[model samples]
Every structure is written in structure tokens, then in C-alpha cells.
Target: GSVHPDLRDVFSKMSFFDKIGFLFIHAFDKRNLWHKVPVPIGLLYLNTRRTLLEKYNLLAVGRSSHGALFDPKEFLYRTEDGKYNDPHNAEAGSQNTFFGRNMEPVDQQDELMSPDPFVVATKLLARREYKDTGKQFNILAAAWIQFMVHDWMDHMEDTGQIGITAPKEVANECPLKSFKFHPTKELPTNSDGIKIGHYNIRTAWWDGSAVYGNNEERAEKLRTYVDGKLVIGDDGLLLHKENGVALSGDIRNSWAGVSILQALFVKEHNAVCDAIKEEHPNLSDEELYRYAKLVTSAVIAKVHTIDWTVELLKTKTMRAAMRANWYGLLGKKIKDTFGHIGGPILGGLVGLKKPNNHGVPYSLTEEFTSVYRMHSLIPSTLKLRDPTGQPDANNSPPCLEDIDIGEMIGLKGEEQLSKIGFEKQALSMGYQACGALELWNYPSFFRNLIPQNLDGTNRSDRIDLAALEVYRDRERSVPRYNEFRRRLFLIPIKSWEDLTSDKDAIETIRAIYGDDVEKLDLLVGLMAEKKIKGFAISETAFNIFILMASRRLEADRFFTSNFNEETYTKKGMQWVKTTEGLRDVINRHYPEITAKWMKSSSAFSVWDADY
Candidate 1:
């Protein structure tokens, strides 16, 4: 038979044994060959790969249909445009295409101005008070979710203005009479209308495209070309070009939190180069860079999966579930010791032997994007503290400075980074606590902030980001609180009281949505709802989180079939396997100070108070 178009690259590059093993393994899945082979015999055969059942269990939840298991169309490598993850349904999550939805579009076209977004913004969401993330979790954890959102999805916006009339009271608070939201660019429907959906500018894969760029040309600009590394200045920070903006895959959301992650992982890409070169002494520069990018991306996925998630969710069930997402239910110890086996269920989503697009194709849903409105995580100010001091055992850490949230973003952020240095800023991020994601904690500056055009020049439009977050969901026709939960197979809150025990929150929500949980915006409910024990988010948001988190890894070929020695090289795979999280990466780069000062066991946890 002619080589399968999808398998052609695998055959050309893989060894003769791997090609046969690959063919037969799929032959078993395609022809029910694994059933015929017997588990014991299959074990003697491709034991290094996943067992059939392991793959099945991991995919069973999201599988939309009985896909052509063998001829499944995702290419062996991830594409810049995000196609090929489900080649038969190529546009599912590709750049410039529409976002997927949890509930169908027809059911959700409510009036955008119904609840008066400005009133909701002024009364319900405006920061009436501040609260720290009382758990040991730090600002880095907050930054991490934003970093991940950039990696996963960003919607395209039109230059046209969204006419949001602010109440005089709300306008007076920000001391501005008017502000504008750039309307989200909508798709020309499956048949035709803006009511159908909006498109994403970024590919919806978790492919570190935030650090490395999603397309060919921008990807080229990030590279240094001399030993498979992305550009870094002599001072070990991102190299800014014409407008003082740091080079990265996505930059418009630029802030210290987002900016430093770019620098850190680009450094990580180079480190992977050194590690891979040690093993395969003679690979070409392109080969080294590609493989390094693959490995580093996997490392990025791993850190988010286990480290940030476990700490944020901070529950045994979620920790177990997340571990299962990576190592699978097989658990890390067994999967690491015996190699991938038992099938996707037991072994884990990583090295799950195949991509399971669940037959519907793989775009992250608007509902998925909708649940992540976490601006409250940014506190009013970032407190920088000196790590070198020895505090009295019972005392608080020594504070060096307090920078306003507004001063720490865009061009101003670069200037601050130049003055403070990235390493120290990261340490400060680890040491201080960020505000929680509940209502009344959103940074006040977003109310009247002047946003930057990519060229460092100021945009004519000013933003009240909190209000616009509420507006965007309405504009996109996202299901409101109760309807959103019901659609995602969750139990809808029956009353305003059913959502929270906070009496004040109930009164304010009643004032805004008027006893109708149906009118409650998704963000307002998540901010108001009682969260899962130890979780930083509400159960409603986590419902979407549970599905999307695993799907991000399982649907990508790099984290699935291509997650092996042939694609990642022997050493590259080892690097990904051994590397634990952001802290490990940090310690590697900042060896002398981090190990001593980073008192918290988890990187997402608050670091030592300068003892």
C-alpha cells in the first residue's frame, strides 16, 4: 500500500523497526489487532509504547466518535497554524478561524446590554476591597495562568469601537467620561452572521507558541540560528527591537508576568539544545532547534499540568487527576520505571501513542475561554523584597519597593525590568502574595488605562478591562452563569444564595441580576461562588478546566504520538521526563541564590520570607 500521507514523515525519519511497529500497532487498533494479539504478547512486542486500554480510557471522556484510528489525520509534528490536529476538520482551532463553543451559538444570542455591563462593572465587579490569596500561592501562580492563557488562546479584535456608555458615577470614579472596547472580530458564520461566532488570532494549542511564535515568519525572527537558540541579549533578557517591546509569540498583553516567562523559556530552549547536543553530537542546527523546541514545549506543558495546577487547585483529587493527565492513571513512578504501558488510562496522556481529537476536531471552546477571566488575580501593586536579608525568625520579609500595577506593564515594565533585573523580579514574584480571583480584587488601574499599540505608541481608546470582560462574553453570546453550568453538564445554581454564603455578594448580585441566576454573567458567578476546597477557582470554572486541561495535551501530537525518542531524541526526552517544574528550571539558571532563598517546596507557593 502507498505510504499514508500522515505517516510519511514518521516512516522517512524513523528506523525500519519503528515503521513496522508503528504500522502493526495501528493495524491492531484498526483491525482490533490488539484484541487478537493478547495483552501478554503485545507486552513482549511494543512494550515501550502504551497499551491499548490506556489510550482508550484517557480518550473515552472526550471522544466524539469512532475515528479512523489508524489513518487519523493529525500530522506527526504540530503546525504553526494549528491544523492537522484534526485534519479532516482542519479549521477547528486554526488561527483566524472561529472559536468552538460548549453550548451551540443559536441558544445564546442574548442582548449585549441587558444587565447594563457598566452597572455590573461599577457595582458588582469594581474593587470594593482587596484580599490576598491567603493560601501560600504567590503572584507567580497568578502570572502563570495568564502566561498559559496566552499560550492557549487569544481572540482577534476589530478596530471598530464597541459603544459602552458608562454611568456618570462609574465614569467619575475613573475620572473619565468615556472609554472604548475594540469589538471582537467575528466569523462570517457557517452559513453567514456576526451572531454565529468570533475567531481566535492565536492557534488554540498549548504549544508554547507564546514564547516561540505560531507562524513561520515570526518564528524565524525569534531565532538566533547559531546552536538552536532563541534570541537573548548579553544581559540575559529578551532583545527588544524598534519600539522597546520584547520579542515573543504574543506581545499585546505585555506585562512583567508575561514578559519574563518569554525570557525564561527561551533560555530553557537553549538549555535543551546543550542537553541534546551532548547525546547526539552531530545533528544540524535546524534539527537541534526543532527537537529542542519540541522538548521545551513538552516541559512547558508538564510544568503547567502538575506544578501550577496542583498548587492552584490544591486538592488531592485534582492532583491525582493532573498526574493522570501527564503520566496517566499509570502514575509517574510506574510510567517512568517501566516506560509507557497499560494504555492511555493507566499510562497517562503523555506518550499516549495517538492523538484522540474525539472526532469533532480540536478548537478550545468560547466557554473554555470565557471561564478564564481572571483579572482579579492582579493586585493593585507588586511588592519587591530583598532576598539577601536574614529576618528575625518570626518577622515579615524586608520590602525593597512597591511598584503600582500600571507602572509594571508595557514600555514602563521594560524600564522597570532594566532597573530591577529579571531574576530579582522573579524572586519578588515568588515571595509576595497576589490578590485572589474573587470579586472586589481586580486592579483599579484597568478602569482608565491607556493601552499600547504594538509600536509603543498609545492607542486613542482607553479601557475599563473589567467591564469589557463582562461585555466581551455578552458580545460573543456566551451562556450566562446558570445556563453555562447547565450546558457543561454541571448543576445550575437555583438561586443567588445557592451561589455563595457571602451576604454582601448575594445582595450586590441580586441588585445587578435581580434574583435571576440566568442573568448572572459567568465571570460574576465564578467570582461569587463558593470554590472547591483548597481550589483557587470555583467548581464551575474547574468544570471547563477538567475537560480542556487534558484535551490540550491529548489532542496535540507533540504530547501524544510524537512524544518519543524518534522525535525528541533520547536525551531530549530524558530532559522533559526529569524536569519537574518552573522551580527546577529556575534553580538551574539561578543556582547560587534560589535553592537557599526559595523556602517553599513548590514554585507556585510563596517563597521564604527572607530568612
Candidate 2:
């Protein structure tokens, strides 16, 4: 048989798979690897089967063991574990083991080291076929490879199994047979049937678990089907239904969430840099870095504020009971798993693993996060924050660890009552407010006491007015109360008597000096000062005091004090009357104001209209 003169050079450049096809096209040609002979029928049968299998919806990608898209040897043989007596291994020596070099041996350690068989096959076809000629066959081969890769990805999505060309002794066994090896092909021949070299690469047929192509039973069932050796992911672990549950919430995904927000922050930072450059004219890289941190911190503050908004809203949920129940379950889980006691605690898990740094310490990474998510229930569960409120620390639910009975012992009667009420409300609202009880400067309930003289007369005016003295000195300078002090306002107590047994007098005092009454009188004075009130207040504070007294009289006329004990009780509390009046005062006094201030702060602010 003589080669066509036109294809003489093209045949030499063809990959082994492509050459195999061309040879089969002219099947009568008798040739051998090194000796001139007849084309093997086994190889022809294998290639034809692959071509037919590809005709249906069954997608064959780069380097199918059944056929050769490029050089059959280059594309089909496994670099790590192909063996003899395997028909699908795609090696002639393995197909005809007695006649030629058979069975490529690989070290156990080198199993996962080899590049993806699909990648190698695709590269071979791309180099040999697609590069020189954009033929339909070449495009089809490329498309096949793409389809297989996509299918592999989908396989991972469903079954959490990725293609691993490496063999694992425990979970994966290579199904290659023992075979004799040869130094070279038995015959000697080149592309033109002339003797060239005796060397030949040893390889075996493909045999192992069926890795792909069966979509009959279930997509998840595809895990067991491997046609070649493959290792699990980077962990050397096997894929199971539980692996998805355990590893899905791994730190990588959490970082991915933060990174997404970080990117937006960075983008905004870049814009800030541009604006700064426009004004500054010359800014160094160091300045840019500095500005990036500043802007990023600002962005994080905004994100924190948004997070706080969402958390606060969660407290008012129609499904708050459900959340409460879930929290209880999580609390019990913590106790069962780690011996933690009390309710679900928010832990600080964010900002622990800074960008460009190594991951958050392992000890801290798994334990913290918040509840709720933009998606599923498990996702929200994983997002649950630890009590410490950070990304990298494990926080347990509050118990005796956070609150102490010793601290309550020396408290005044009012303070004791307040602490009790505070503790109850704090626990009900799911707060760890008791943790800050020992903090100094914010003395518990003493701030509200009326000043008294030895003569038993009201000396509130003559008591040096220390509260306002501090406020007058630093009110504008601090903007609002410091964050540490603001925590007091979030302490979760209902009213003054909640701290003392003098619970009944609380109503009478509140009738004359409630938040609503005080603010109402203050507004009346301001209105009169602006000529809005019909008559101006004569003695400023004294005049406002008279007006508040008048309102108290009107209230007393309707509901005379029934429980006028020295202390106050929450039982006969007129919270409705107080809150309604307060809202009215708030609405009219500060109609355009739109910020909330802590009750501890001298700063007067109001909520936005929506709030």
C-alpha cells in the first residue's frame, strides 16, 4: 500500500487519535507501529463505537477511551493508572498485550499529580486538529470537551463529586490488570512505513468505576460510576450526602459573602481616591492605601449600621416566637455539644480574617455568625452569630458567667428592683445586658431620684444640678452619648418602679414628671419663645413646671391615685396614656427630626418618618 502524496505530510502531523481515524477510513492499509502490516480490527471497532455513541444525546468530550479525537495514545491513556486487559483503556499494546509494550506503571503517591485526562485530551486535539484547521470535526471535538466539562461541573453541583484522575486505595480502586511490559514496539516503522525508532510509550486499557454518562437512576447516583481512577477533592475525603451539609458552610463560602461586600467597598474606595486626587492634585500610593482603609472603615460602619437595623427589626418579627424557639434549640445544641448554658449568644465572627491575611484561626472560625440569611434555612442557621458577636470566636449562651448575684446584693431597693426588671426584660428580648452591670459611671437607678433637703423640702433645684453640669460641659463636643453609655439605654427595663417596691407612687410621679410631660412643657416654652404659644413662659423652667403640674391635675381628676404606696408597681401602670402622650409630643415637637438618640444622651433626636 502506498500513501497519498497530498496527505503525506499531513499524516505525520496528525495526532495518534486522528491518524487512527484516517487509517481506519482506508482500512485496507496494512501497517504496524514499527512494521508494515494490516490495521487492527479491535482499534477500528472501538473508534466506530465511540463515533456512534456520540450520535445520540450522549456527549463525548475530549479524550474518550472509546475513540481518538486527536492522537488516541495522547488523549485516552491515563497518565497515572491505565492497565492491561482493559478494553476501554485506549491503548493498542493493552488491546494486543502479547505483541507490544503494555501497562503504564505509576507510583501510588503520583495518582493525583497528573493533570486532568480531559484537559490533556482537549489540548492535544486543539493543537493537532483545531489549530491548523477549523474543520467541523475539530469544532465538534472542542464542543464535546466543553460539554463534558460542564457535565462534570453539574455533577459536582448535584452529587458534590468532582472528576479525580488519581486513584485512592481506600475509597477508589484502579481496575487495571497485570501485564507484561516491553521496551519497544515489536515492529520498526515510521509514518512512511520506513524504520525510524524502536521506542514506544507503555499504556493499558481504561478500566475502573463508571465515572459518568448514566443519567437513569438519579443524578446523585452518578457518584459510584467511575470509568477511570479519581481522587476526592483537595481533602482526600469521599463525597457523601452529609459532606454537603458539613462543608457547605465552610469559611471559604463565608469569606466569599464578605468579599462580595468588600469588593463593593473597594470600588467605592477607588472612587473616593479619584475624588481626593482631583482635589489634592498629587497623592502617593501610601496615601491611597491610607484613604482606602479610611473609606473601607466608613463603608463597614454603614454595613454595621445596616446589620443593626436588620437585627432590631428581627426583634419585632411576627415570627419572633419561631426565632425564639429556634434560638432555644440552638442553645440546647450548644449545651449538648459543648456544655454551654443559657440562650443563643451572638458571637463576633466578622472582620476576624482580614483581607490578604491567612484565614481566621480554626478555633474561632467554626463557632460564630448571625441568624437569618438571604436564602435557605440551613444557610440562615450557619449564618447564626455567636454570643461574642464576631467571626472568629466561640461564644456561649449567658448564665452565671455573665450576671452575678453578688453585684445585686449591695444595690439599693430601687436598684434591686430595677435589676430584676432589667434582667427579665433583657432575657425576654434576648440580650446580654447584665454583662455590663459592673461597669462604672452609669450608676443604676440613682440618677432619677429627686434631690431632698434635711428639712424635707424639694432641693432638686439646689442640688448643684450635676447631671446638667456634665451635659452642658460636653453635650455638643461628644455628638451623642458614647457607645458604652448607650448600652445602658438598651438594658431593657420597663419603668422606675421596676427597680423598687415603691411601685404605686411611680404613676403619680410620672403623671407630673413623665418623659411626655417634661418634653411637652419644654415644647410649650419653645413655642411661646418663638411667639407660637399664645403666652410666653414667665420664668422659663418654673413656668414649664406649672404647666406640667396643670396636666397632672387634669389626670388626677379622672383617676385619683389608687395605689399610693411609697414605691411603684407595674400593675396599675398607665403605659397607654403615657406612650400616647409621648408620641404626640414627639410628633409635634420634632416634626422634621429623623434620628434616634439614646435616653442616656443629652442629645435630642427623633426617629425618621418610617420609624
In TM-score terms, which candidate is top? 1
Give the poorly placed runs of model 1, Cα more than 4 Å off: 1-76, 87-92, 106-110, 191-195, 392-397, 454-457, 609-611
- Which candidate number maximizes lDDT? 1
Q: After superposition, how far is residue 231 of candidate 1 from its true place, in Å?
A: 0.5
Residue 188 error for model 1, in Å? 2.5
lDDT of 1 by residue, 495-519 (tens): 8777889998888888777877688
lDDT of 2 by residue, 491-586 (tens): 112343422233433443344335332121111111112111111111222221222221221111011122111111121121111221212222
lDDT of candidate model 1 versus the reference = 0.72
Per-candidate TM-scores read 0.85, 0.16
Candidate 2, RMSD to the unseen true structure: 40.7
Evaluated at residue 226, the lDDT of candidate 2 is 25
